[PDB]
Amino acid sequence: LRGLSDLGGRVRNIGDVMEHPLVELGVSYAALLSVIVVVVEYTMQLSGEYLVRLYLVDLILVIILWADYAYRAYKSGDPAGYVKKTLYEIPALVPAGLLALIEGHLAGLGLFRLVRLLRFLRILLIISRGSKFLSAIADAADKLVPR
């Protein structure tokens, strides 16, 4: 009920354990596709049909990611606080569907300024996730190193 708290030994064991090699690989794989998915939409502008399927697929990827994030969220016992702490992680989950509806609302009102900033955010959003991709390959390369 609002006050002091402790989070170390707990998140420590559960941390090094939760990040089980399988967990890391699974997330890394999903992240890889996620990066390409957003890039495809940014680069290519497939028809509305494919776009619908792309959004659906993208949504699923978020669910898997939410699994890990959601796990820690409840663990902290304070999702609201946990979120304010992972603010730098939000941009990574920013669902396309959520922005899509918001973007449409702004456009309907006759706003284009926000749209411009939003576009830049899209490119920046990909760069942010780029760290995850780079980290995966970096570690993978060290582990793989076949010769």
Whichever domain contains 101, its CATH number is 1.20.120.350
- 52 within 8 A of 113, measured Cβ to Cβ: no
Secondary structure (DSSP) of 64-124: HHHHHHHHHHHHHT-HHHHHHHSTTTHHHH--HHHHHHHHHHHHHHT--HHHHHHHHHHHH
Q: 100 phi and psi, to 5 degrees?
A: -55, -50
Please enumerate in sequence order all residues whose Cβ is within 8 A of that of 95, keeping only pairs 6 or more positions apart, or say none: 58, 59, 62
Domain that holds residue 120: 1-147
| Cα Rg, the chain, nearest whole Å | 18
* Cα atoms in the 13 Å half-sphere on the side-chain side of 90: 12
Q: Experimentally, how was this structure solved?
A: NMR
Number of domains forming the structure of the chain: 1
Residue 82 vs residues 12, 78, 85, 99, 116: alpha-carbon distances, Å: 17, 6, 5, 22, 30
- 96 within 8 A of 58, measured Cβ to Cβ: yes
